[PDB]
Every structure is written in C-alpha cells, then in structure tokens.
From a paper:
We demonstrate the broad utility and high accuracy of [name] using X-ray crystallography, cryoEM and functional studies by rescuing previously failed designs, made using Rosetta or AlphaFold, of protein monomers, cyclic homo-oligomers, tetrahedral nanoparticles, and target binding proteins. Incorporation of noise during training improves sequence recovery on protein structure models, and produces sequences which more robustly encode their structures as assessed using structure prediction algorithms. In contrast, sequences encoded by noised [name] models are more accurately decoded into 3D coordinates by AlphaFold, likely because noised models focus more on overall topological features than fine local structural details (which are blurred during noising). In protein design calculations, the models trained with larger amounts of noise have the advantage of generating sequences which more strongly map to the target structures by prediction methods (this increases frequency of designs passing prediction based filters, and may correspondingly also increase the frequency of actual folding to the desired target structure). [name] solves sequence design problems in a small fraction of the time (1.2 sec vs 258.8 sec on a single CPU for a 100 residue protein) required for physically based approaches such as Rosetta, which carry out large scale sidechain packing calculations, achieves much higher protein sequence recovery on native backbones (52.4% vs 32.9%), and most importantly, rescues previously failed designs made using Rosetta or AlphaFold for protein monomers, assemblies, and protein-protein interfaces. As illustrated in the accompanying paper (Wicky et al.), [name] designs also have a much higher propensity to crystallize, greatly facilitating structure determination of designed proteins.
Author numbering: 5 to 133
Write the structure that this text describes.
Amino acid sequence: KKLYEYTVTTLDEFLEKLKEFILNTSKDKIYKLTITNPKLIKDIGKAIAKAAEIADVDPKEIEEMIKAVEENELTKLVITIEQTDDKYVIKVELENEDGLVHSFEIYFKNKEEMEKFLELLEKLISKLS
C-alpha cells in the first residue's frame, strides 16, 4: 500500500502525474494531487466534470460538482486517484477560504475503465491553450 502526494502547479505537471499513476506497478496505489491556483482549479475541475458527463456519471452529482467548481473564494482542489483492494475510485475535493469542503466520488468497475477515464481527462486538459 503506497500513498504519494504532489502539489501540482502547472497543467503539464498534472498530465505528468496522471501518467506516473498509470505506470506505477503497485497493486495498491493512491496518488493525491493538490492544486491551489484558482485558474487551474477551474480548468481541471471542469475537465473532470466533462469527463464524468461523457462517462454517464449521475447527472445530479455532476451538477453539484460544477456548483462547487464555480463557487466564490475557491482555494484548493484535491484529487485522490485510488486503486486499492477491490476499488477503483477518483475522489474530488473542492475547498474554499472558509474551510468548507465539498467532496465527490467517481467509481469504476475495473482498472481498464479507470485508465480510460484518466486518458479522457488528459485529452480534455491537452485541448487547453
């Protein structure tokens, strides 16, 4: 069981760490990526929400995640990418200056579906100018 944490300060860093996660050979692996640049928070949060829409995640969950991404005084996005036990999950936490955190999970049935989602996220982030 391995937990890695990174502070992500550019879009290229975000793409690099998704790659590192996929290529990590551990059976049980967790990467936690922290983003504090509000412009990058919105870029990446909107990309996750769009990827979730394409993946047919619960529409009300996506609507709530967009609400969090659009909220005033956003200060932190934390993305936890987890493969452990029988679970394949991405957790999204959006935090504001007042310390209020909204959290969301996106589950996958297997490893292949999770890596396909991560590749979708990379494609969406790559389109950004």
